[PDB]
Design a protein around this ligand. Structure first.
Ligand SMILES: *[C@@H]1O[C@H](CO)[C@@H](O[C@@H]2O[C@H](CO)[C@@H](O)[C@H](O)[C@H]2NC(C)=O)[C@H](O)[C@H]1NC(C)=O
Ligand SMILES: *[C@@H]1O[C@H](CO)[C@@H](O[C@@H]2O[C@H](CO)[C@@H](O)[C@H](O)[C@H]2NC(C)=O)[C@H](O)[C@H]1NC(C)=O
Ligand SMILES: *[C@@H]1O[C@H](CO)[C@@H](O[C@@H]2O[C@H](CO)[C@@H](O)[C@H](O)[C@H]2NC(C)=O)[C@H](O)[C@H]1NC(C)=O
Ligand SMILES: *[C@@H]1O[C@H](CO)[C@@H](O[C@@H]2O[C@H](CO)[C@@H](O)[C@H](O)[C@H]2NC(C)=O)[C@H](O)[C@H]1NC(C)=O
Ligand SMILES: *[C@@H]1O[C@H](CO)[C@@H](O[C@@H]2O[C@H](CO)[C@@H](O)[C@H](O)[C@H]2NC(C)=O)[C@H](O)[C@H]1NC(C)=O
Ligand SMILES: *[C@@H]1O[C@H](CO)[C@@H](O[C@@H]2O[C@H](CO)[C@@H](O)[C@H](O)[C@H]2NC(C)=O)[C@H](O)[C@H]1NC(C)=O
Lengths: 98, 50, 50, 170
């Protein structure tokens, strides 16, 4: 888990190979690509309450707002199952209303 | 005997130079260890959360 | 043969904004190699012979 | 050893090669120093630049970002650090990387870590608002992002006061 210790990117596994006076490591790593721009908000005010994502982040393609995981684009509809509530929408700086 | 005197001077100066070089090598090894530690710290704590 | 001033690399201005992010949509898998010495030849020397 | 004397050179000649390996060791040391600096500092493929407008959720990085006013393009703390700290056949060789390039590396690193979080260390830098990066980092240590989003101003003020205190102490 320690970053950049073995391989550049998110580490997956490694394979050893013998050398005449040393060792050779083959590191397998995961590298994301083909990024896209999106609009973001930190929480959603619904019925006067504030909703935060359990795991993920809010995005929108112009409209309708979705929750995604942070390392791979996969939008899902926002539901009470993958969000949790905390207080009212009065102190968060950046609330959008959906 | 000028050769003898110059030989004494030569061996003294050569010994001093050898001592200086050895001390430099030891200090360089220590500095290299410190630099490796710095590189690891900067890779692990600046580019990510530890 | 041409002598020049070395370049630290390219330069880009990442589009920062307070309400915008960038999310990947695809991925690749890379295999990289690294090499590490672990040993050196074992040698022995005899005085009287030398 | 000899100081431009022919007889001394002739006498020293019969000691074999006591001088090739000395210079070899010194050159190895110098190359090692250059490699040390290069590997500790050069860790980004590109040179990032901070946006002209700076609204990082209330956090204030002005003391650490580079100052275009000064010729050296160094920050306040770097200038403080630089100001504070102080031939007979021997020579000193200049380092391969000059101070401006090192400052440029540090500036690029710091801009990248402010804007893109940790993403720029693996693939391509992806932008994200700073407050959300703080929320992720609190989520890292087992505290829900609720705490950050409910106490943004206090956290910003504490960070600014800490940076001012460290400035004054240094
Ligand atoms: C954003 O993505 C959503 C999700 O697909 C889009 O909503 C659907 O878009 C398709 C294609 O236009 C329509 O056939 C559906 O009727 C839409 N669903 C609903 C519930 O309206 C939306 O169009 C996308 N918006 C933009 C600007 O690309
Ligand atoms: C993010 O930045 C935008 C700048 O586009 C801020 O929008 C400004 O908000 C103030 C306060 O309502 C308005 O007076 C300005 O007219 C807005 N600027 C523009 C260009 O519309 C916004 O406040 C910032 N913070 C967020 C979105 O949380
Ligand atoms: C979310 O919905 C609420 C309720 O409609 C909006 O709050 C209203 O804001 C206007 C403008 O200040 C007031 O005149 C109303 O009295 C408010 N209604 C309330 C408090 O119930 C709110 O603006 C919406 N979210 C956003 C981001 O606009
Ligand atoms: C995301 O949005 C930006 C804003 O329009 C796009 O444009 C880039 O903006 C930055 C900052 O000004 C420039 O450095 C780039 O040259 C712009 N790209 C252009 C003009 O093609 C940006 O392309 C969008 N996409 C990504 C992946 O950032
Ligand atoms: C992600 O990238 C891979 C690799 O570029 C894409 O796979 C290629 O897709 C094209 C289009 O169908 C094919 O012609 C190639 O043969 C595919 N490559 C391989 C190695 O199979 C993939 O389509 C991309 N996925 C997305 C969602 O963009
Ligand atoms: C970040 O902190 C610096 C402290 O150095 C602020 O700069 C000071 O701002 C006050 C108010 O305008 C001036 O009276 C001081 O002379 C400034 N000091 C220096 C050294 O320039 C700066 O304003 C802060 N950033 C923001 C956005 O407020």
């Amino acid at each position: 888990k320690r970053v950049d210790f073995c391989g550049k990117g998110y580490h997956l596994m490694s394979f050893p190979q013998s050398a005449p006076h040393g060792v050779v490591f083959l590191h397998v790593t995961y590298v994301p690509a083909h990024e896209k721009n999106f609009t973001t908000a930190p929480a959603i005010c619904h019925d006067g309450k504030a909703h935060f994502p359990r795991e993920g982040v809010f995005v929108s393609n112009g409209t309708d707002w979705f929750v995604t995981q942070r390392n791979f684009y996969e939008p899902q509809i926002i539901t009470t199952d993958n969000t949790f509530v905390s207080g009212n929408c009065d102190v968060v700086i950046g609330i959008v209303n959906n | 005997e000028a050769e003898v005197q110059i030989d004494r001077l030569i061996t003294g100066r050569l010994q001093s130079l050898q001592t200086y070089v050895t001390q430099q090598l030891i200090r360089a090894a220590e500095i290299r260890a410190s630099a490796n530690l710095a590189a690891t710290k900067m890779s692990e704590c600046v580019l990510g959360q530890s | 043969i041409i002598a020049y001033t070395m370049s630290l690399g390219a330069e880009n201005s990442v589009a920062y904004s307070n309400n915008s992010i960038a999310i990947p949509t695809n991925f690749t898998i890379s295999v990289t190699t690294e090499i590490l010495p672990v040993s050196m030849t074992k040698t022995s020397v005899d005085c009287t012979m030398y | 050893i000899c100081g431009d004397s022919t007889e001394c050179s002739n006498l020293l000649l019969q000691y074999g090669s006591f001088c090739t390996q000395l210079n070899r060791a010194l050159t190895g040391i110098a190359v090692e120093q250059d490699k040390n600096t290069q590997e500790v500092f050069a860790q980004v493929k590109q040179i990032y630049k901070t946006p002209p407008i700076k609204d990082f959720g209330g956090f204030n990085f002005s003391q650490i970002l580079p100052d275009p006013s000064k010729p050296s393009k160094r920050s306040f703390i770097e200038d403080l650090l630089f100001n504070k700290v102080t031939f007979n056949g021997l020579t000193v060789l200049p380092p391969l990387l000059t101070d401006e390039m090192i400052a440029q590396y540090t500036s690029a690193l710091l801009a990248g870590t402010i804007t893109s979080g940790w993403t720029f260390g693996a693939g391509a830098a992806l932008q994200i608002p700073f407050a959300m990066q703080m929320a992720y980092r609190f989520n890292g240590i087992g505290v829900t992002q609720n705490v950050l989003y409910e106490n943004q101003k206090l956290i910003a003020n504490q960070f600014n006061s800490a940076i001012g205190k460290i400035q004054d102490s240094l």
